[model samples]
Target chain A: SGFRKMAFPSGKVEGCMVQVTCGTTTLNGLWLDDVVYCPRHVICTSEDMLNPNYEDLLIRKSNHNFLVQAGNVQLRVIGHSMQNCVLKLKVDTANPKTPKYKFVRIQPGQTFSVLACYNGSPSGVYQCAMRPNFTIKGSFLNGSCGSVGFNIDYDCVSFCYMHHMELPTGVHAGTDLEGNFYGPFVDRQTAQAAGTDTTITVNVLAWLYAAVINGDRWFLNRFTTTLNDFNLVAMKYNYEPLTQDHVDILGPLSAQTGIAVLDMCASLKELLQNGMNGRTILGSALLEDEFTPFDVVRQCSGVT
Target chain B: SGFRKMAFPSGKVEGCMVQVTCGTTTLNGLWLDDVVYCPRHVICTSEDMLNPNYEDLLIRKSNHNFLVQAGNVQLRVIGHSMQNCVLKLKVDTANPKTPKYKFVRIQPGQTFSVLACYNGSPSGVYQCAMRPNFTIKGSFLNGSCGSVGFNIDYDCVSFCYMHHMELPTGVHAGTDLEGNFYGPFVDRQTAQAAGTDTTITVNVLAWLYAAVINGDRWFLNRFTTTLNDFNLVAMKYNYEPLTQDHVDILGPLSAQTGIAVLDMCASLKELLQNGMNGRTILGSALLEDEFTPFDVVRQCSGVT
Candidate 1:
């Protein structure tokens, strides 16, 4: 039997409403800590809800309290309970009729970012809930069915948007910045989502963001600085070359941020030949020294 | 003071000779309204030239009267009025610099199309001119002074050319459906002018005359039927649900369409939320039933 009303003992919603519903009967705005009875509905209120022992319980450790971060296109959720819990993430971007879902096991107190951990889908809002089959544990103080939503805007791999260089005025270029999977390289027949082939997904921005936050700002900054010179190197080495026209079009970062963009013309020849994945760049082995945004993203995403 | 050679009054170059110049001078075939001028700058006598009425101003109208259409982009000419009089349009299916230029405009009777009427940019051949001070009349007379160069390819908005939909069996979704320009929303700050912000251009097989002229059998069959189901009655309350999941994933359409794509999901949500821009649903006010290809484009272009 479900409680008629409930309330949380702490946090902003400490005394707020937490409605309860069962069958056709519905209760509105009742917190977990509160005690109330429903005439026809059964109510189960454990003493644990009243004064739970925080010190003894294994709870979330992350500083972020929110479920989704729209700006960074990231989602954060702390596993709260004495035992580990298995979480399920469901996505519904593109085609709502056909949604995608994935599962991950999280240890108590472990903070996980959807894109950071799972490499299943590209940018989208994920609705995360605790898997029902798993053994129930301490209160899920934070997330519940559809309670936690994570949104990722731009994935770095499949596609990336960027500004045109200013000097060139109106010359735009790039269909496949990530050369490996674009521009004739991709098999359109196999790319579509049928029963056999799954749609392609890219989370490049997340890779990039994780990098800067993961301690590669200097490398990224240097890459942008060297951007003006790498065009020739790109061309000479058979990589997508960056033209001066491209540079002027991209202009200075003061006007346009450098690392955030994915340059299609800037070939991955150097990066690929050198060895790099989604997050790790293995800079020690690849080049003299420079943290290309590509390297940072590759390294950050644990792409190795 | 001006050009000493001009020709017209009939078809082809006739007996009149056209001249060319660099550091020196050359000759070729060209035409004016009527009077034939060439052969060492000698003028021709045509009764039609004496005082031709402006009403019957040897004009051309509609019906695909011209081939090239340039819009939005700006062009510059060194003003070599004394040298180059004819402008040519060149295109390259693959490379850019190796563009093909053709002298499609020859007579004053040709009426060309300009983006002036429409606000969409597609990728195709660019028409360049050698700008010179000439009293342009007869509605720009097929663009001169290299003033008619427009970019046509894939843009984030409007109808982006894409490859045929590919399926596991025999259907393809789009051309490199996910080419680029996504994975990230692209901060135009860096994306706009970044040399990397490559402007991808693709004029898909659909643009070819064959698609339309090949036969309307397939389209006519589908449109006539689909038209019966999609009206206000179908959208009263429960048609297609617009959910948040639909928005994030399409984030790449920006980058993908920036390359080769046909954004279908984006149109649905945008049409649902933003009241359709490129096309109108005069269906309630205008039509009986039918989804015309023109209607689809207009609707996609945010015309509502």
Candidate 2:
């Protein structure tokens, strides 16, 4: 099961391939933009479609091609991404108080910096949020209590897109697959629902986690699963390396859905420490739910 | 002083006026962009100028007009600010990982955010900075220690432009009038030197601090003085409101230089709490030493 209607910030709408085998979807998500986010491949059964050959058509390898949009009648598709490229972040230590936000030559000894971080996950589009009142009374809870990471900020209480484990009692804020606040509290029960949060989370990660999930959930399975989720995201976003709590929550949930969780924390920490040295900022990773990776942000910002 | 030769990131060159009175200056600042940043107003005594009426002509108030370039043989100047208007900071909560960097209309329920913060003070141009590894070990030593405020992340460890009071050992990094790293650590002895860090600090604040420094520096005096600095910087930058440590540092420095220390922290905290509220993000605040205010950053960013 493959194609999900994809719309890029560039306004270029197209189909991004997803490998959804046994997944669920909730189409009427909060982010009701024209484009659909759920991958049709998993839902498109020959039994549901008018074409007897629908299954055969999608069975081909082209249906799984990320670079090519897999077209079908069930979704509103877009192809040519239009203008409205994102603006670069610029922080000039020289004019901190009065920023005339400009691209200038960086003379030697000039301290200019650029950053790219967002509040979203791999399953859905994230938001560009400013955690104005972030403060950690103590070290940030790694997903849950006790098991935390070393070298990370203990109290980073700013703004945030609380991760599932980071989410309190599964009642945290919820967004559509496109990162728009849909307001539904995703839960264990929600995990079994179709066409909503859980389905697409699995749909987006399905292709990558093909061998990881075989209908069972285990802590060991998390290594095979979350790692794939992290790699897919790291190549696309500023992944904050997942901590113990992050993994702890996802492992149980991955067991629950028999599908891997879409997370970014682990990758974020890794890149922040080491610039995306080997990761490629692929030109083909654009979609309705996308972010500018951290590595490319500084150079494009013209801080130098 | 009258005018300071200014070069804009836009590649625009112009003369900006300064109202230096009984102020000090250090021209050889770390940030030595091609154009000189020090104003010539106070430095232009009739004795320093060749004109016999240099004193009489200098008496004119136009020399202090920010809108007009007060020309003089003693300084470099810019007239029109050119290209490189500055890239806007775009954060799409939807696409947190792979930012496509586009200016798409934020559909209802879409969570997009834009921010503008720099690392320089009011007296100089700041550079674009990204506090990648920012964390707080404890309630930030608000300039310093126990006397702190409520409602700030105590353990938010992150990168920063530490304030003077926040300056440990009074020996933090130093930058030029334009914010380039000059490598000379600013100090009390350095405060008396001409054309370096202290001078322009006084130079830029002279016209504003004229009434302020006619006499001594006091903690209560900070009300009138730091408030002035805050207002000026807030209107010009994403200023962080000055705190106790900030005041503690500045009050003493003001007493020493008969000048003032600039601060943006308190103003930043205020804006963070309540947007810009009634404050006007002035169009005239632009300068060789400038920043784009927080209030206007979101609108200009097409986030709405």
Candidate 3:
């Protein structure tokens, strides 16, 4: 039950990448002047054109280079990518005092779009989004997925081609990418979706988990192998260092975020102190092969 | 009485202008490229040139200007000025670990001449200095007379010209100012006796008592009656502001020699606080005013 109500004490792990897309877009967010932020390499593919081959692709990459795009688009995207953690997004505005609404419960390989009516004919801004749940993992459990080298799980990465008109109504607050807010648009036609065949590409890492864990209890992991029910997001932007949470968990944790918890602190302390310096800014190596975690409780108990 | 000691601080009060003369001179100090700091607006009258008019007297109005005269001959002069406090001048060849000496007081309103071999003969640089000295409340002090102001039988100011030269035959330090030293000269043929009629002009002021209490004590109360002895120091140098107590305290003492304290302070502060705003920065009002003992003890306490 990947959709189970589980929460990581620490939110998403540090230095992981994610994507976001708008919902019910009105073609307002795609103008050259729009300010849109995506984690990194956030390429968007058309809803029906997922996995399109070269022959089916219509627009050539050369003609679509960014400089020629009149109104520039500027944006910054960050995310917590550690397994089974919630995600958050914030958009900057004029006054910068009162911020726009925020969205959470985001998982990796998902897409969320923030589009504005940058210098486009249409008046409002809009957004559209997609999140895919299916991923390629090593094995499975009794109606469950088998654990790999560590607790790393396999989940499909997703992407999509989004048209400006397909995005939901008015939202984001930003200007052109190269500075200068979008100016007057001569006609609504200028705001038309640049091209219907634009493709979004997302690179999925080999083995990463998407387990839902809450207060000391592992909740559910979402999966439906056949229909590939879980949505996979494709990235359509540039490279941005991924942001996430890393935990040495010097201590235990409480249910609410930013809280500390533990019953027998002294015992846990002795074990960890005598354990190892195996620490990584990235979260539990048990989740990513990038590193390894220590077996503290066992080592202290003389079992290892 | 101002001549009680060869180097007495003079005037009825304190901080009056002073001047000293040397048979011949060659100015030396902090320099950059071919520019150096020298005193300015200094008028030198030779003992022999008094046969008729003092109209050919050297009066420098700029940062660097000069007049060279001998036997009824005068030549206008010019040069570049590379000004700076603490000019890192000397390179220590022996102890490479430490750079040796630096010039600290390359002031403005001071002019120097260049002694050179122009087309293979000796032509030297000699300029006027407006050094303030102590005279009397109203009696005039003439520049050509070479009479230094004397207070109660002690020399309040030295009207003597000073120069920097290599350490004498067996001195320890690498270089030093020839305190009372003169010349890198080749102009002995036209040289005037250093102690000739180099009288400084001074004026008197009315309302003596009120002026003194008003922090203008050193000046005469009325300029109409008695001989005017106030040495008018023309504001010419832009001083660098003083941050440390050393330079701040010296500023007032230096003003006694007819230094335009306010203009000096303003110019210096402007240079020092080049990019700073008003409040935290030292300004004209703070650095410029002449504060009296009463101004210090009573004004701050209020007459009431």
Candidate 4:
């Protein structure tokens, strides 16, 4: 059973890009967080820039989190997950049928790249679109897939947009401009399922609620305060220089909070610089500091 | 008369930075488009990154619109307005009362810089917080002021977050992940009130509708389709290199459409690279291409 529902945005259909004199209609291809670069773009848009910076000395500790590939391609299979796991992934080049490009296997230490397509091969144009998978707002990449070390690359990445499940918008997954991620079904189990080191199985807001419900506003406030500081720092990074006041807050706060801030930062840095294999920033770091309203969502919702 | 509301965000209050923050609670300062940087952080956030990229040969024309300063500090006093305009700017270093830093003016050929404060300068720590002006999100700048030509430099900037004015949430300006801007009263008068080459005068959607109501879906569809492609390209930008097929769509579409897309993109680029004088990306370019629902907002509304 997959943790995420792999479907196009609701009201949407299977990917289709057609044209004759018309060249084609396309969305950008992006990195993904799924096992491999599965067929999801909205969730995998590479938002590496928003990743937190780990070298923030004010925080005192190093960064924290468990995610190799984040965002649409959420993942945390480090260590032995892909080690010695040489699976035969093959993509039939000449499939005269639905030739939809299925996840192919690459031997260890192998690499490959190409355009990402939807509907597989077999159409003059609509039969197959040479479009790129796109996320809400982030970088695009050429389609490619590979298996080097424990890292697995996909022909594309998947990104998700803000979906306010808690909002009256219904139960479909979407993202917000603030980079908050929503899931109908995510919780402790979800976190553990994806890999604890880098997986955040709870809606960040809900996580705070959990701490509060667990009668722990101390941790939640601390998390949000420190969290707010981190994100607030991002605003200051390019616009204004850090004041002693800011450093004072971070320095003092760092002593008390978990290494979560730095962890998030470092993880983001990793994805920003290199692919967490194929992880994305949207899934990992960007969501770290979002401030959400508690009026709607409660706990890691289980409605979906 | 002010076309915009001047105040802190809802439920928010006059800025305060009590230190013992141990130091101080500071937000980054940003450039503003308001007549001058006013005190509206959330509504004035600068979001130039999302601006459309102009100069795309595919779009077929030079960029197009009217906007001198956009964002929290929305403005359009270009040309004769500021010419020979002299302003008196005063910052009482010793205001024992609620001397909240009021807007000041500068001579036609002068420049100034200083830190911005929320309360007046009577805080042992909290009395007057030296926080930088901030918007929902974007660059932060050190406080400064100037009356250089048509532009009025503010000691800081203000930003706004998305406020789904149309949501069941009642009436208030908001934006969505899609960059769609919402204004309770933004019709032809609203657009024309601001100024034209750079002034939107009308909610873009309303503008399209006007064309349509006047019996012109021809323009709306063309606008949306072209608009989508432009935004779609932003996703593909760095991730995937443009292929021949990709250019084909843009190039062909370019031949038949208003320069609206490029105009939006160019404005964004201008804001991103420079400050539209002190304008913001949120108001100018980013919101230009947003897609909204026809149900909630019929024409640039006039409710507010």
Candidate 5:
């Protein structure tokens, strides 16, 4: 449609650039420096003043940003976001008995924070990740729709976050993202020279999470193999391995869950014959270690 | 010499026969039916009074009896024994996380009672046992020498105590020694009908103590065997069994301590293959369960 001159029902009012609402409709058009009157009639009433150009205002507000901080072993979120916007945070600590989680709600153009502490222990070296909790299904004002998925901002130790590329040399020995400093060894030789204390403590979570998200069932097989060796050491100590029934159950479950299961009998044979080498203690040590993941959410009206 | 009448250092001796202390030495000699002159010099003095005949009174006190009762989930020991006599009670509750021990001491010719409750869960059908805390090095009055060891009146539920020989039919269904009524089954059929609650508890201490006392290396092997299966179950649950190095360490330990070591590796295979058929659940159950032994003795002047 071409631009057409229309008559104003109320009165002729001209401006260089102006936007007004006419009932449920909004009017936005440009005019020349000189005014030209038109005889065509257009509907304009006082009731139109009740409505504003929300669609344009919403486009301006949708570009909110977010930030995070660590406070006394906790993670805090701060930002300006759309009203009713929610952020989900996942934290993975090495302790097996604990669950980690964090949630934050931000009002339109407001800031919010969350605590990362879980049960029974300090948040050891951990990874903090965030994602929008809503979706956009259709075109709507303020980006409020049921179909658009929020974005993810995963922040963790450099080792975990940059595992896909060449690891930064500065990250080789220093404080991790969690602020704990470890290792002075330049290589295996220096580590060996320092004795058992020099054994590197790696961020196991990054790989575990990566495997889960990537659906790399093959990576999980490592646990089974590790478990077999671990059990072999146990058998040498006069212990039993998992029942054949348990392993058999895992078979069908593996196919169902996309996690492969090894034959129990074969695993037993392998475990018995392979004498854990000289690293027998490692199995026991691993058995005693714990790991857990958690989620935390900021309460309504609570800042931190 | 047996009929010789001895002159009393202190004139008026009474109570059928006389007992006097000769310093650290306790005098136990014959007294004639009638008075007769004794020309031989005897070691009798004020210092001798200090060494009253512990042996004689001990021999009389050695006939002391003992009884056990569960008063509000706690094991109560009641008995009578000589002064300075000590009793050791050992209770084995199957919970590994709990420690079990009890000790009691009773003064010369006095009544005694003690409460033995170790930390963790109840004995859960366990062996109850007792023995003298220490042995007499030399003879004292009637207590005699090595021949007269103090007695032990140990008791516990049928599950733990009566596991030695043929399990009596009467015992197959009745209240356990602890007063908890359990089982009405003729065999496994009736047991199954009762659900997982039909767990058969066994007393493992009598034989364990017998092994310790008899220096029966074979009895010790049972521990190694039992330990092997127990560990196997642990492995199935993703835990490491005690290492062979630990068992190897026990090699010299067994010899020094008069116990025997079993072939742990072979036991694991047997446990894995045999699957603990007859007492399969018992083995697995024990593996999953924890038990501890406690000892209780009366104090010189006991209260609770």
Candidate 6:
């Protein structure tokens, strides 16, 4: 039997806390994460938490977390302000219950992030929303399930903004902007207890750290000193030639140790004709008498 | 104003060594970081290094780092004689090099994981590759006499892969894969240095050192009393209703950190909508709900 008082990420809901939505209301000094919508017997609006299934739906500050998707929509952040402030929101524009045309499409296994700004008002409640891709129709598609009906899956591709204590005001600066994944909403679907894609499990996703290249060029030089030739690929695009800018901008952070590459523009043609013959003349003046088949593979894939 | 031996990554040339095709054949077993050549070098018939140019060249190895570009290619891991080998790779098809394609497109400042298989023979080297975008033109772009205009730039993305070592092989059962930028080809027409358009920089990409989620279920649910709401965004494609598979594939090793993300999917529909909310959801989730508007703005614009 499941352990009594047994706890897990999603295996069982925590204390008797109710889930509630702000519903177009604003709190001057209250941050979304601090403003719990539903405490005990938490209030949940029909337009807010009606979805039978929710994904990636909690905002965390240190260890304190809150669920702020409810009743109203839209939260704005203002510059400097005094006194408490109220917020205005565009309620279910697409809520069929409200017979509105401003409907948002959400599907299973999808998420969304919104930006909040101030409307030239003082003491305003700025808010951002976190929700699964609208389960509504006519939106993006969550391809996780794929055509394979029986093998449904989900992971902790979650979100979190950095929160530091400075006493007065804390800024909402997304810490890992490079590791976010948003949207794929399309058709609204449901979950089953035991079916083609049945089986509920709990998992907590924490950090997606970027790989780095230790910012050392010598590592590469030394690597080649041993293994003469190797294969090389790009970040994602393979259209134009690679450049130092691309590397400086994104390389160091990802590959902490280092990266190996080729000079397609200058070396592609040269290597083909001579195969490292003019290596010294070209530079790095080392001579390699033999190479590997893998080396050949790297040459073939130089560029289109 | 540069230090003599500052140890910065040498753009194209490594430690004053110029590599020419025919001049010197590639040294077998010599591996380097950030280097490679085109196919001509692999299948070069010319024996002299004197006559080598764009038409044929070898991909440089071991320079800035071990990052490669995209192209029709192969990669044979150069180690000792071994067995049970798996070739792992993280393909960032979103790079602007040439093959402007992607299983997933990562954003300019985002990161992701890449994995591949390797279990067959030849067991000596791990060789696998894809077609590249196009060769880039190399030359001095905007620089003075001492400038040495030798930096790289590209519209490419990075990727990673993982492989398992086999028997008869003295390697480990698993190996992490990562890549970086590789380029600065001379564009004859432009007289400027350019790398393969698909020469995306590969940051650090490795296999799931450890994962917490898989498929539609958790690999193991850690019993805890706290509740956390994780958030994620994908910039490559607009995804909604995130699924277990989607999360698992991109959410492995890094997913268990609670609040970690999977970025560069394709679109930002969800993030945008969340932005409009006049509350601190974005602040609490990504930014700081306690941050002042000024601080938040500064943090937003000052993202690295």
TM-score of each candidate? Answer: 0.15, 0.18, 0.13, 0.18, 0.14, 0.17
Model 1 regions lying over 4 Å from their true place: A1-222, A225-304, B1-304
Worst 10 residues of 5 chain B by lDDT: B1-10
- What is the clash count for each candidate, in the order shown? 94, 132, 142, 92, 78, 299
Ranked by TM-score, the better of candidates 5 and 6 is 6
Quality class of the docking in candidate 2, CAPRI style: incorrect
Q: lDDT (CA) for every model shown?
A: 0.20, 0.22, 0.20, 0.21, 0.21, 0.19
Residue B9, candidate 6: alpha-carbon lDDT:
16
Q: How would you encode candidate 4's per-residue C-alpha lDDT over B107-183 as one tens digit per residue?
A: 11111111212211110000001111110111111111110101111222222221111111111222221222322
Give me the runs in candidate 2 sitting further than 4 Å from their true place.
A1-184, A187-304, B1-173, B176-291, B298-304
DockQ of 2: 0.02
Question: What DockQ results do all the predictions give, each relative to the true complex?
Answer: 0.01, 0.02, 0.00, 0.01, 0.00, 0.01
Candidate 3, DockQ score (0 to 1)? 0.00
Cα lDDT tens digits for candidate 5, B1-304: 0000001111001111122122232221111222111101112233423443534533432211222122223222222222121112222222132212222222111111111011110100111121111111110111110011111222110111101000221111211122122332221112122222211011122112222332222312343555566566545543335445535544443444454444433344343445433231211212211111111011101111
Tens-digit lDDT string for candidate 3 (B1-304): 0000011111111111112122242222222222222222122223523341223333222322332321122222243221111111111111211112222222222211111111111111111222221111111111211112111212121223222211212110111121222322211123322211122111001111112323333222122211111112212222222223323433433344354333333333342334222221111112221222222222222221
lDDT of residue A213 for candidate 2: 26
lDDT for each residue of candidate 2 in A39-90, tens digit (9 for 90 to 100) = 2222333354343233343344232221211222222223211111110111
Error of 1 at B36 (Å): 8.6
Deviation from native of the Cα of residue A187 in model 3, angstroms = 29
Could you tell which candidate, 2 or 4, scores higher by lDDT? 2
